[PDB]
Amino acid sequence: SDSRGENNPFYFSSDRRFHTLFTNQYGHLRILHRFDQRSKQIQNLENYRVVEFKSKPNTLLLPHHADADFLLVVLNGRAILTLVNPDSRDSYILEQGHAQKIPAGTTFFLVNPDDNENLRIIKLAIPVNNPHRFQDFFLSSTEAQQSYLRGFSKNILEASFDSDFKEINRVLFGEEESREEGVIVELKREQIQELMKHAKSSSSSQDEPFNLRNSKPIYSNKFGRWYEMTPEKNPQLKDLDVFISSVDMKEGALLLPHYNSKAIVIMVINEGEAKIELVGLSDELEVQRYRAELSEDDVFVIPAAYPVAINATSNLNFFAFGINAENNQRNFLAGGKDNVMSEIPTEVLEVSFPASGKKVEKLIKKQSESHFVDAQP
């Protein structure tokens, strides 16, 4: 009666739950299948899309903008993010863990300055025109796509650029100098240098990128570490009412059963393997079990209030976006810290469970560690 694997509606595997928007020899862009189409239980995520981006060393994703706000996050590798504005531009160096909100319609390009490592990015998108999807407008002209400038008539273009259409087509379109093949190209090492010296490394600005990784972990012991930034801590995060998390776990570590009070969590596996257990209510009852094994790039959604537990089967790190973030309270159901069960009066425990109240409190204090424990032990 359990919902496991690809039958688990909260599981979005990279193997079967993504759609490739673009892919070539240098990298790819993939968009996660819609949340609400997979399950009505997370219908309120219908206004969010998730994009995964990967590109090989010394690559560049060409200038483009979208009718969607983006909360870009670097899961693995390093990158140069340049936001191009109407009368200025800003380049930033994003290290693993760095996040940055990109207002909708902001033209931008991305570089993987690393000479040997791939760049992996996870991006939360909030569409503007249609609540369920957005469009990527590439200003560039490649064999894979026409520049949107091509949408204007000859007369408009000639009067706009104060030039003959033959020069315009020759220089910008190349649709009788040759154009690149796709929206992800490889740059010469020297070129990466020029772009690199102009970028600014992040050392909570309303604009500049931030790294939750270099803040004090909210939870930290021998089995795991948990970094988290909330809208209370960051203005970009407050605008989106979203919190972000980055958690490390050693092989054999267990993230104890817990539930987020009001936040809907979208998590992604950065590296490692994990077994996750989610509890829902069956459908005047009985609990509905949702199980899944997560691997690199897999996405999983933890609905607000649904109890959850994660067992790391290998060293692991996962990232998470918390929707409806403001004042979320993480309620643990075991351990000696943030444990809501330990906050219930003896008299209430007496009637809430079969055994006596004192017999329940005794069992509750058994586990002396908090948040992360030995999966065995």
Has 158 been labeled as part of a binding site? no
Footprint (CB under 8 A) of a copy of itself, residues 226-285 = 254, 256-257, 259-262, 264, 277-281, 283-285
C-alpha–C-alpha distance, residues 376 and 366, integer Å: 15
Has 353 been labeled as part of a binding site? yes
222 binds a copy of itself (CB under 8 A): no
Using the minimum distance from each CB to a copy of itself, give the nearer residue, 202 or 311: 311
315 binds a copy of itself (CB under 8 A): no
Footprint (CB under 8 A) of a copy of itself, residues 131-160 = 131-132, 135-141, 143-153, 155-156, 158-160
Footprint (CB under 8 A) of a copy of itself, residues 104-133 = 104-107, 109, 127-132
What is the three-class DSSP state of 276?
Answer: strand
199 binds a copy of itself (CB under 8 A): no
Residue 323's nearest CA partner among 39, 31, 140, 71 is 71
Stretch that binds a copy of itself, among 50-58, 113-121, 266-274, 297-305 (CB under 8 A): 297-305
Footprint (CB under 8 A) of a copy of itself, residues 52-71 = 60, 62-63, 65-67, 69
Supply the minimum distance, in Å, between the C-beta of residue 97 and a copy of itself: 25
C-alpha–C-alpha distance, residues 364 and 339, integer Å: 9
Residue found under tokens 């649904």:
306
Stretch that binds a copy of itself, among 70-78, 212-220, 292-300, 303-311 (CB under 8 A): 303-311
Supply the minimum distance, in Å, between the C-beta of residue 223 and a copy of itself: 11
C-alpha–C-alpha distance, residues 364 and 53, integer Å: 44
Using the minimum distance from each CB to a copy of itself, give the nearer residue, 248 or 338: 338
Cis peptide before 354 (omega within 30 of 0): no
Q: Which residues in 254-265 are b (16+ Cβ under 10 Å) and which e? A: bbbbbbbeebbb
3 binds a copy of itself (CB under 8 A): no
C-alpha–C-alpha distance, residues 219 and 339, integer Å: 13
x/- letters, 330..369, toward a copy of itself (CB under 8 A): xxxxxx-xxxxx-xxx-xx-xxxxxxx--xx-xxx-xxxx
C-alpha–C-alpha distance, residues 60 and 40, integer Å: 38
What is the three-class DSSP state of 245?
Answer: strand
Residues in CB range of 227: below 8 A, 6 or more apart: 97, 212, 213, 215, 217, 218, 245, 246, 247
| Residues in binding site for Ca(2+) | 350, 353-355
